[PDB]
Structures are given as structure tokens and as C-alpha cells.
């Protein structure tokens, strides 16, 4: 059923759209719209099919898909890891309990500052993107009178580096006094349906990890990256964690790997709930004005992407989905077809929990949405709806 | 002299970029990185441009373009309206000082409780977007027991209704005993540098004015909506607000309603500057990359439109000019300020000048990456004030903190 494809948490009960026991309608009423609403089950099960698939594995969640600190301190609680590109990442994956141990560093977001503060924290492993980071956390240690861990991304466009020149910064590296070569790093890509590129990608690193080793290196960690696609439209067929394990077994070595995902474990655990709010022509095109817009899920407006739309209650068109936001961008779905709804209807947009709240803005002086979470009849507000008084609050009394 | 064709107090001395006499290099060691900075004297005389042009009509600011209340009241001590499109934007026009009598509301952007608020802060004008927005402002405005004024939306995408089928709903909303008819509005589009289309827009306006005040409508007001374009592109010659005046001069002559005009990016765009400190060099392959701390996450027209700001260095140096990625900090490949641009060599720890922010800048940041959005300060004639603080962490995830 196409439903339980995307959550299998989600059923109608006479009509009425659940989610763990809970009908989004009633949290709609009681909470209000636009709402997001997560599956804690659905989480802890996408991440428990890491953990299976990969039983010796380090699951590190990548946070830049979602930073709901009661979300990440559910995954911490499994013994997830937290891979973070940011301070404000770093700051929250402490908050939320996860030790520097299991904490790994990308990306380019690296001011002295973060960086800094992840060198003094102990992280297991920073994910180096060019030989500048390499010479500014060799400084840093050194002031700090401590070690930095670090792994060069290699790629099997700002991002990483050519694999066939990576010997070259493994050397460069060697010779820095305060850093500490422990591992090698790729992440090839994200929304991943076809798992086949992993393997090519997972062979050239095992081939860099032998040479690197033969060449007197010391490589603890290979970390794999994320990238693993969900379910988006009727007819994706999403990858299983089991799936990709089954790809690359018979490549995978004394390292410990290292997995990255982020949109495979949030991205249909969260719904968002949005109540129509106008419907209108123009000429023979048809428009669902709803109170839900690129503020909120940004997605549709800026990839094109596609995002499946339900009524929350089912009844006995084709249209554009759009959001209050004065731009012309401002859609969820265009020329989608739909049962016919009315004025004070709810809709579901799936497959709204990575990279939804995530890059939600206060465009239109709007508040962002209140965000709950659902487990098997229970419900936990996990962040309140924003108010004016917030979006402006730095301003206020200066 | 191009810099000054952007923002005529913008300058180098002694190869240092000032802004109102303020330097640039020492905001950004007060204040930090990123930060957007703001001309006060470029802001109030974009606005009397509009006032000098259109002296007898009402110039309401476009709120969606940068909601920094410092910035609004700014306007509304000058004597400009407000065009909001929420809630959220009629609270900000509040706070700020400007009366509801100068503020109008467009957009799709209209909750039931949006709708009360404006019907009872009774509001100039409703800009009507759909016919089932008519019942609705009826309904509520009818339970207020107070009126609500209407304009129609016409065009001469989700808004607007075609001007061909416009009386129509003219003929409908007279019908409804709580909604007061005092208006036509039209917004054409936006970052218009040829104005010649507003030429015909208005005269389809004008007629349909002609036409309902014929069948005895009272229409009182006129909203020829905003959109005059700015200077973008080193190549962009934008219009102003003189320029417009003159091209609608002899149409405007056979009205007598008031005027509403709504420009947003035309008073803010190049009022707006974002600062950024370069953080690494790269070059992967035969590209360049100046990696900075200022992203789409700050400034994200670039990544979605792949939009042109114009970007300078803070200290010039005489030094060969370089092809470059200018990217930030946000763990996307689309996260770039500027692609294969021609930029001075610059240095980790130098600051750069992203022109042309002011505008749907900071009005569309996010905490995307859990980053803090940036500090704001506004310049006058050599001093400062700070008109937004820097946020910290804390600030992004306090609505999950204790409840």
C-alpha cells in the first residue's frame, strides 16, 4: 500500500489520516498548522537497519538534516554519532549527549572559532577539504597543546579531492607535527536510488586505505559518507541500509567504517500539516492556496523536487499546491493531481523530515512551524510554535 | 565611477572601502563576519526620490523586502506607508510607528487571524487575491461589525485576476454588504529596468477606472504596485523613480484618485552591503575557490536564481586579478556567492563587499547548518548604530528548550 511504502506508521482509520496512533487530524486542531509532525519509531527503526545491516559500523547521523535537539538526542540514546559541519552542529550533538568520539567534522563551514572549539572537544576525526584546513588545525592544536584527527575527503565541486592526487595530501599532512592521520573519508553524493556508484567509489578508497597502509600509514577509520536515497515519488524504489552492506561486503579490511546518513533516517519520518486556506482559477488552471509555503518546506521552489500530497481526511482535480509567500515561486506541487478539497481541510506533505525545517526561514515575517513528535499514542512538543516577538528579538532593546 | 553608481556613499580611501564615512574593515573587526551593513542617508533618499516624483501620492514601503524594524521606522518617520503580505508584517508596520491608514495588504498570504487582525486595525486596503477572499474579509469584517475596504488585484502564476474578467468580481464584491469598494491594484512584476511595460499597464488600469467609476463605483485609490529595478550588474542602468513619473504623467492626468506606489528593492537593494572574511583558498583542478563565512544561508539569491551581486575587496592591493568560486560555509554544492567572477587576489583573514543586499538579503536567511544569522548595523554621516544583534545558538533552537 503506497501509504506504508513511504511510513509504514501512517494509516487511514475511517477516513481519517494517523500517524503512530494519533490522528493528524486532532494535532492539526490542537497544535494548529503549518505542523510538523515526526515518527519516533520510524527514526529509531531507520536507524536500528544501520546498526543490522552494518553490526561493527560507527552510525554517524549527519545533523544538517534536521537539528531538532530532542530529535538528535533520540538518535544519541541508540549510540548514534553525530557527523556535523558546523560549531552550532558540534553544539548541539553535546547538548544532545553524544560524545566526541563519535563526532566527525566536514565540509568548508570551519572558522578558527569552530574549529577551535572541535580541536579542544576531542572529536574523532576532522573531514579535511583543503591543505589550508590542514595548516590552520595543525595551528590550532599546537596552541592547544593537543592532537587533531584528521581524514582527507577524496573523491573516487568546492568539495574534496581528486583521489589520484590525494597521496600527495596524506604526505603533506605527515609532516605536521600536531595532526594525526587516522582516516580516509568519501561522500559521493545524496538521493541515491541507484546504490551501483558505491562500489566503484568504496574499491578506489580500499585501494587508497592499501597504499596509504603499505606506505606506513595508520588508517583507524574509513568513513563512507551518507548519500543513501528514500522515497519520494510513487515510483521510487528507496535503497535498504542491508542493501548497500550486501554491495560493498565483499570489498570491506581492519578499519572501522564509518556511515553517515541523514535524509535516509529523517526524511519520511516527518510529515508536514498544512490547512487550505483559498482555492482559485485563473482561466482553467486551478490553485489550492494553503497555509504552508516555501518558509516552511523550501524543496518544490528551489530543486523542483517532488513531494507527495494527501488529504488528512479522505471523501468522495489538477492543481497548483502554493504557499502564502508573495513569490511567484512559492509552490509545493504543481499541476498535481488530487482528491478536491475545501476551506479548513488539512493536506499531509510527506517526506518532510530531512532538509525541511532545516531550511525553513521567517520570509513574510513568518514564524517557523511547531514541530511534534509522535510515539506509538504518545505526544511530545518538540519545538514550539515561533511567535513575531522571536523573528525580531535580536533587535529588540539593543 | 561604478562603485558610486551602486551607492554613491560607498568609496575607497587609500585603498580601504568606506561606507558613510565608516570603514568597512573596522565594522567588520567590531562586529564580526557576516555582517550587513545599511546606508541610513541612501535608505531616506531613495524614499524621497519616490516623494519628489510623486508628491501627491502615498509611498508605501514593501515590508517583504527587509523587515528590520529599526529599518521600517526609519521610513515611517519619513512618512512612508507600509504594503505588507502577514501578519507577522502588519505587527512589524505597528511597531514601527506607521499608521494603518497607510498600510495595504496583498498577497495570498491571509489566515483567518491575519485577516481579523488587519480588518480590526482597520487597514487603508485590502489588495483582494481571490473571489473566496471576498466571502472570507465579508464574513469576518461582518463579525467585527466594522467594514472592510477592497481594491481587486488585476493583470493587465497564483495572483492577480486577468483585468478582462476583473469587473466581474467588481460587480460581485458590491453585493457584499460588509466590504467597502475604494481601490484597483496591479503589481507587474519585479526588478524592471525597462519601464516601458508600466506604460500600457497603467493605461489598462486607467481605463478600467474610467470604466467603474462610470457604473458608479467610488474608486478612491490606485495601487500601481512596485517593482522598479535596481542596479545589479556593473552593465545595468536601473530607472528611477523621476523616470516613471514622467512615463505616466499624461495617463495619471485623467484620475483622480490617489496614487499608491510599493516599492520595496528599489529603497533597500543597494542600501545593503553583506561583509565576509575569506577562510581558505583552494584550487581543485583548474578552478579557483575563496571559501568565506557568509553563505546561501545569509544570502541565498545567487544559489537559487543564480542571481549577479557584484563583489569587491574590502582592502584594494594592486594585485593580478583572479577567476574564482566564491562559495561559503553551508554544506551544499549550490552554496556559492558568485561563480567563475573575476575578483583581486585576497588572502585568508581579508574581508570581501557583497554589493546589493539590502533587499531580499537578510529577509530570506536561515539557520540552515544550525548557523547563527548575522549581525546588522546601519551607518549615518561617519557613525553606527547596531540595529540587529549577531545570533548565537542558543537562539536557533530556544522554541525546543524547556518545552
Redesign the interface.
Given at each position: 500500500e503506497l501509504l506504508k511504502e513511504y511510513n509504514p506508521y501512517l494509516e487511514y482509520r475511517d477516513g481519517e489520516l494517523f500517524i503512530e496512533g494519533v490522528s493528524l487530524k486532532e494535532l492539526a486542531q490542537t497544535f494548529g498548522t503549518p505542523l510538523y509532525v515526526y515518527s519516533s519509531n520510524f527514526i529509531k527503526e531507520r536507524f536500528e537497519a544501520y546498526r543490522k545491516a552494518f553490526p561493527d559500523a560507527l552510525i554517524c547521523y549527519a545533523?544538517?538534516a534536521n537539528?531538532?535537539?530532542?530529535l538528535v538526542k533520540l538518535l544519541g540514546e541508540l549510540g548514534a554519532g553525530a557527523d556535523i559541519?558546523?560549531?552550532?552542529?558540534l553544539?548541539?550533538a553535546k547538548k544532545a549527549g553524544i560524545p566526541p568520539e563519535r563526532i566527525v567534522y566536514?565540509?568548508?563551514?570551519?572558522?578558527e572559532k569552530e574549529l577551535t572549539d572541535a580541536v579542544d572537544s576531542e572529536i574523532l576525526m576532522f573531514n579535511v577539504?583543503?591543505?589550508?584546513?590542514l595548516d590552520?588545525l595543525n595551528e590550532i592544536a599546537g596552541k592547544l597543546g593537543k592532537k587533531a584527527r584528521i581524514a582527507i575527503r577524496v573523491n573516487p565541486?568546492?568539495?574534496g579531492?581528486?583521489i589520484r592526487e590525494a597521496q600527495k595530501e596524506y604526505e603533506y599532512a605527515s609532516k605536521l607535527e600536531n595532526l594525526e592521520i587516522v582516516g580516509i573519508h568519501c561522500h559521493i553524493g545524496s538521493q541515491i536510488l541507484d546504490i551501483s556508484p558505491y562500489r566503484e567509489a568504496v574499491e578506489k578508497v580500499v585501494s587508497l586505505y592499501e597504499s596509504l597502509t603499505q606506505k606506513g600509514f595508520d588508517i583507524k577509520y574509513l568513513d563512507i559518507g551518507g548519500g543513501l536515497g528514500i522515497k519520494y515519488k510513487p515510483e521510487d524504489k528507496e535503497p535498504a541500509p542491508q542493501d548497500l552492506a550486501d554491495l560493498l561486503k565483499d570489498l570491506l579490511v581492519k578499519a572501522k567504517i564509518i556511515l553517515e546518513p541523514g535524509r535516509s533516517i529523517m526524511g519520511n519520518a516527518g510529515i508536514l500539516i498544512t490547512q487550505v486556506?483559498?482555492?482559485?482559477d485563473?482561466?482553467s488552471k486551478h490553485?489550492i492556496?494553503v497555509?504552508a509555503?516555501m518558509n516552511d518546506l523550501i524543496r518544490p521552489?528551489?530543486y523542483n523536487a517532488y513531494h507527495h500530497i494527501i488529504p488528512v481526511e479522505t471523501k468522495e482535480v489538477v492543481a497548483?499546491i502554493?504557499?502564502?509567500?508573495?513569490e511567484?515561486g512559492?509552490?509545493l506541487a504543481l499541476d498535481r493531481e488530487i482528491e478536491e478539497v475545501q476551506?479548513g481541510e488539512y493536506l499531509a506533505v510527506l517526506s518532510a523530515g530531512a532538509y525541511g525545517f532545516?531550511?525553513?526561514?521567517?520570509?513574510?515575517?513568518?514564524?517557523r512551524a511547531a514541530?511534534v513528535l509522535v510515539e506509538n499514542g504518545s505526544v511530545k512538543?518538540?519545538?514550539?510554535?515561533?511567535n513575531?516577538d522571536?523573528?525580531?528579538?535580536?533587535?529588540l532593546d539593543?
Open positions: 545533523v544538517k537539528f531538532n535537539p530532542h559541519v558546523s560549531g552550532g552542529e553544539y548541539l566536514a565540509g568548508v563551514g570551519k572558522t577539504e583543503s591543505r589550508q584546513e590552520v565541486s568546492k568539495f579531492v581528486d486556506q483559498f482555492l482559485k485563473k482561466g490553485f492556496i497555509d509555503g521552489s528551489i497548483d502554493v504557499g502564502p509567500i508573495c511567484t512559492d509552490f476551506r532545516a531550511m525553513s526561514s521567517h520570509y513574510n515575517m513568518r514564524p514541530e512538543l518538540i519545538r514550539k510554535r515561533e513575531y522571536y523573528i525580531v528579538e535580536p533587535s539593543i
